Short mmCIF file of C-alpha atoms and ligand atoms in Angstrom, two decimals:
data_model
loop_
_atom_site.label_atom_id
_atom_site.label_comp_id
_atom_site.label_asym_id
_atom_site.label_seq_id
_atom_site.Cartn_x
_atom_site.Cartn_y
_atom_site.Cartn_z
CA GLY E 1 -0.03 0.14 -0.04
CA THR E 2 2.98 2.48 -0.50
CA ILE E 3 2.31 5.16 -2.80
CA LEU E 4 5.15 7.90 -3.78
CA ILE E 5 4.15 11.38 -4.34
CA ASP E 6 6.61 13.72 -6.44
CA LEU E 7 7.20 17.05 -4.84
CA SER E 8 7.67 20.10 -6.95
CA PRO E 9 11.04 21.88 -6.77
CA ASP E 10 8.86 24.90 -6.16
CA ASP E 11 7.16 23.40 -3.04
CA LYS E 12 8.64 24.61 0.29
CA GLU E 13 8.70 20.99 1.49
CA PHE E 14 11.04 20.09 -1.48
CA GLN E 15 13.30 23.07 -0.75
CA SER E 16 13.51 22.37 3.18
CA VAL E 17 14.42 18.61 2.67
CA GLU E 18 16.93 19.57 -0.18
CA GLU E 19 18.53 22.10 2.20
CA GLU E 20 18.95 19.47 4.93
CA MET E 21 20.53 17.16 2.40
CA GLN E 22 22.91 19.67 0.97
CA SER E 23 23.84 21.45 4.33
CA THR E 24 24.83 18.40 6.19
CA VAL E 25 27.59 17.11 3.86
CA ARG E 26 30.94 16.70 5.37
CA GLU E 27 34.42 15.41 4.79
CA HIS E 28 34.75 11.72 5.76
CA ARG E 29 37.98 10.00 7.34
CA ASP E 30 38.01 7.44 4.44
CA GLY E 31 38.81 10.35 1.97
CA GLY E 32 35.59 9.43 -0.04
CA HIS E 33 36.56 5.86 -0.50
CA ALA E 34 33.00 4.46 0.69
CA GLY E 35 30.67 7.19 -0.61
CA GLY E 36 32.56 9.21 -3.24
CA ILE E 37 34.32 12.54 -3.42
CA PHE E 38 31.84 15.42 -3.66
CA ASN E 39 30.89 18.42 -1.79
CA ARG E 40 27.30 18.81 -2.92
CA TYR E 41 24.49 16.76 -4.56
CA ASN E 42 22.41 17.02 -7.68
CA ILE E 43 19.01 16.51 -6.30
CA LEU E 44 16.84 14.66 -9.10
CA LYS E 45 13.55 13.92 -7.33
CA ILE E 46 12.17 14.22 -3.84
CA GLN E 47 9.10 11.94 -3.25
CA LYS E 48 6.95 11.65 -0.06
CA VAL E 49 6.32 8.04 1.08
CA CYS E 50 2.59 7.45 1.93
CA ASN E 51 1.61 4.23 3.61
CA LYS E 52 -1.22 4.45 6.09
CA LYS E 53 -0.51 1.05 7.93
CA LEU E 54 3.23 1.75 8.25
CA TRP E 55 2.26 5.34 9.50
CA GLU E 56 -0.17 3.86 12.04
CA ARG E 57 2.63 1.29 13.02
CA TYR E 58 4.94 4.21 13.67
CA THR E 59 2.42 6.54 15.48
CA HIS E 60 1.52 3.74 17.73
CA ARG E 61 5.09 2.99 18.86
CA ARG E 62 5.73 6.63 19.21
CA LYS E 63 2.86 6.89 21.66
CA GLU E 64 4.13 4.01 23.74
CA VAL E 65 7.71 5.46 23.82
CA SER E 66 6.43 9.03 24.73
CA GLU E 67 4.40 7.66 27.63
CA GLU E 68 7.56 5.99 28.86
CA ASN E 69 9.36 9.34 28.60
CA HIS E 70 7.54 12.10 30.34
CA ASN E 71 5.36 12.65 27.13
CA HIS E 72 8.17 13.21 24.97
CA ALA E 73 8.84 10.97 21.94
CA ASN E 74 12.16 12.71 20.88
CA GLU E 75 11.34 12.81 17.52
CA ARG E 76 14.11 13.63 14.89
CA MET E 77 14.33 13.82 10.89
CA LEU E 78 17.34 11.82 10.07
CA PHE E 79 19.07 10.02 7.07
CA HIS E 80 19.16 6.55 6.11
CA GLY E 81 21.24 4.97 3.30
CA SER E 82 20.69 1.20 2.41
CA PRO E 83 20.91 -1.22 -0.33
CA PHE E 84 17.35 -2.19 0.97
CA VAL E 85 15.76 1.20 0.39
CA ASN E 86 13.04 -0.38 -2.11
CA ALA E 87 12.07 -2.89 0.74
CA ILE E 88 11.88 -0.30 3.34
CA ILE E 89 9.49 2.02 1.43
CA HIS E 90 7.03 -0.92 0.80
CA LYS E 91 7.24 -3.01 4.04
CA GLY E 92 8.65 -0.60 6.55
CA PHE E 93 11.92 -0.98 8.70
CA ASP E 94 12.50 -4.35 10.36
CA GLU E 95 15.22 -6.64 11.55
CA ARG E 96 16.55 -7.38 8.25
CA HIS E 97 17.55 -3.70 7.69
CA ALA E 98 19.72 -3.82 10.73
CA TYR E 99 23.47 -3.14 10.53
CA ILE E 100 24.66 -6.27 12.31
CA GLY E 101 28.32 -5.07 12.64
CA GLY E 102 27.58 -1.59 13.56
CA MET E 103 29.56 0.13 16.63
CA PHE E 104 26.65 0.06 18.70
CA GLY E 105 25.33 -3.34 18.09
CA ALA E 106 22.68 -4.83 15.62
CA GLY E 107 20.25 -2.18 15.21
CA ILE E 108 19.00 0.26 12.39
CA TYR E 109 21.47 3.28 12.06
CA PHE E 110 20.49 6.77 11.19
CA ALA E 111 22.67 9.86 10.54
CA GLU E 112 22.46 13.82 10.89
CA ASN E 113 25.15 14.03 8.16
CA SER E 114 23.54 13.07 4.80
CA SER E 115 27.02 12.16 3.63
CA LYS E 116 27.35 9.50 6.43
CA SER E 117 24.20 7.79 4.85
CA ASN E 118 25.47 8.03 1.42
CA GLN E 119 28.39 5.73 2.39
CA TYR E 120 25.63 2.88 2.60
CA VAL E 121 23.57 3.33 -0.36
CA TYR E 122 25.57 0.71 -2.39
CA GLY E 123 26.19 -1.53 0.87
CA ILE E 124 28.46 -1.59 3.89
CA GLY E 125 31.73 0.34 2.99
CA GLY E 126 30.04 1.48 -0.30
CA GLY E 127 30.11 -2.43 -1.26
CA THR E 128 31.48 -2.44 -4.87
CA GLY E 129 29.95 0.75 -5.91
CA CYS E 130 27.26 1.40 -8.40
CA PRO E 131 25.90 -1.61 -10.03
CA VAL E 132 26.46 -0.37 -13.57
CA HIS E 133 30.16 0.93 -13.26
CA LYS E 134 31.24 -0.68 -9.92
CA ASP E 135 32.38 2.70 -9.00
CA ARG E 136 31.78 4.03 -5.23
CA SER E 137 32.42 7.43 -6.48
CA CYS E 138 30.06 7.18 -9.50
CA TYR E 139 28.81 10.63 -10.74
CA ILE E 140 26.42 9.25 -13.38
CA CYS E 141 24.43 6.67 -11.37
CA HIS E 142 21.18 7.69 -9.59
CA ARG E 143 21.44 7.06 -5.80
CA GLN E 144 18.57 7.07 -3.28
CA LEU E 145 18.63 7.99 0.52
CA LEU E 146 15.65 8.07 2.83
CA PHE E 147 14.74 11.19 5.08
CA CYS E 148 13.14 9.50 8.01
CA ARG E 149 11.09 10.24 11.03
CA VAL E 150 12.70 8.53 13.94
CA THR E 151 11.44 8.10 17.62
CA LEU E 152 14.54 8.21 19.90
CA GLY E 153 12.63 8.41 23.22
CA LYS E 154 15.27 8.14 26.17
CA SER E 155 18.62 7.88 24.19
CA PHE E 156 21.63 6.11 25.58
CA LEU E 157 24.67 8.57 25.13
CA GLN E 158 27.71 6.89 23.64
CA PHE E 159 30.87 9.08 23.21
CA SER E 160 32.31 7.60 20.36
CA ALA E 161 36.17 7.78 19.47
CA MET E 162 18.45 -7.06 16.38
CA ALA E 163 20.09 -6.48 19.67
CA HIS E 164 18.08 -4.92 22.56
CA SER E 165 18.36 -1.25 23.35
CA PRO E 166 20.12 -0.65 26.59
CA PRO E 167 17.85 -1.32 29.45
CA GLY E 168 15.92 1.90 30.47
CA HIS E 169 16.49 3.41 26.88
CA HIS E 170 14.82 3.31 23.45
CA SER E 171 17.80 4.02 21.30
CA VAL E 172 21.57 4.93 21.18
CA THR E 173 22.97 8.28 20.43
CA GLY E 174 26.67 8.00 19.13
CA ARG E 175 28.28 11.26 19.80
CA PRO E 176 31.58 12.06 17.94
CA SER E 177 34.36 12.64 20.31
CA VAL E 178 37.29 12.73 18.13
CA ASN E 179 36.23 14.30 14.75
CA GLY E 180 35.01 17.66 15.63
CA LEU E 181 33.16 18.16 12.32
CA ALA E 182 30.97 15.09 12.63
CA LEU E 183 27.27 15.05 13.58
CA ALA E 184 25.67 12.47 15.49
CA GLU E 185 24.43 9.22 14.50
CA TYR E 186 21.54 7.25 16.10
CA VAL E 187 20.39 3.52 16.44
CA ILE E 188 17.12 2.20 17.04
CA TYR E 189 16.18 -1.44 17.78
CA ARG E 190 12.61 -1.78 16.62
CA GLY E 191 11.53 -1.04 12.99
CA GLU E 192 8.36 0.69 14.36
CA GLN E 193 10.43 3.53 15.79
CA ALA E 194 11.05 4.94 12.21
CA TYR E 195 8.78 6.07 9.23
CA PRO E 196 10.66 6.43 5.63
CA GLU E 197 9.02 9.99 4.99
CA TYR E 198 11.04 10.99 1.95
CA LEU E 199 12.52 9.21 -0.77
CA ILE E 200 15.46 11.35 -2.25
CA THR E 201 17.04 10.48 -5.66
CA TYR E 202 20.08 12.25 -6.45
CA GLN E 203 23.62 12.20 -7.89
CA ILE E 204 26.82 13.16 -5.89
CA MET E 205 28.54 16.17 -7.91
CA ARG E 206 32.23 16.00 -8.97
CA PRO E 207 34.12 19.06 -7.32
CA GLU E 208 34.92 21.67 -9.65
C1 W8L Z 301 26.51 3.01 10.62
C2 W8L Z 301 25.40 3.99 10.21
C3 W8L Z 301 25.68 5.27 10.78
C4 W8L Z 301 24.79 6.40 9.99
C5 W8L Z 301 23.75 6.11 9.17
C6 W8L Z 301 23.91 4.90 8.70
C7 W8L Z 301 22.96 4.50 7.61
O1 W8L Z 301 22.18 5.54 7.10
N1 W8L Z 301 22.88 3.31 7.03
C8 W8L Z 301 23.75 2.17 7.65
C9 W8L Z 301 23.49 0.95 7.07
C10 W8L Z 301 22.35 0.64 6.51
C11 W8L Z 301 22.13 -0.71 5.90
C12 W8L Z 301 23.19 -1.63 6.01
CL1 W8L Z 301 22.76 -3.40 5.22
C13 W8L Z 301 24.25 -1.37 6.59
C14 W8L Z 301 24.56 -0.23 7.08
C15 W8L Z 301 24.63 2.58 8.58
C16 W8L Z 301 24.76 3.76 9.01
ZN1 ZN Z 302 27.66 4.19 -12.04
#
């Protein structure tokens, strides 16, 4: 029951989502090995993901978390990059979309930095790059990221140099404590705590 609604580039929703995408690009410690070398994107399309069942699943769980956390869902909009983006938008997030080897354990990971999620669009470590050219820094092939509504509830703070959530917590927050330019990464352990709200189709752009 998923439908995708194209947003117009004239729409303020399109513009606000694009700005979040572009403004959260950062340099990566791998020098672009996983995600490619770029400072900005060419946004080709932004679609709204509409699925009533998946939404109701999300808002049900959001209410539960909120009632366990002084009426505060601690909801964020975060990026998700994955080879399973087509499955996620149709069936929702679940245990099959977990990053089993992630630094905070087997959970579903999200980024404040769009360029962090970009590293995972072709798989862990960028896999073997785009399917057409086998290039992790391909400037031709279309990529997709999700911009997702995520319920963090009480988040366990991990200073950073499916499984269960730490007891008493609903998520983990990975706070960067070496790379001063990196934004936070987040992990949830239940698929119902995220809704894939926007599908963004883009290319990375070769620096001038
Ligand atoms: C580790 C991490 C930090 C911040 C964002 C992300 C992300 O967007 N995706 C992933 C990811 C997704 C799917 C698989 Cl199979 C592996 C890693 C991982 C990830
Ligand atoms: Zn390619």
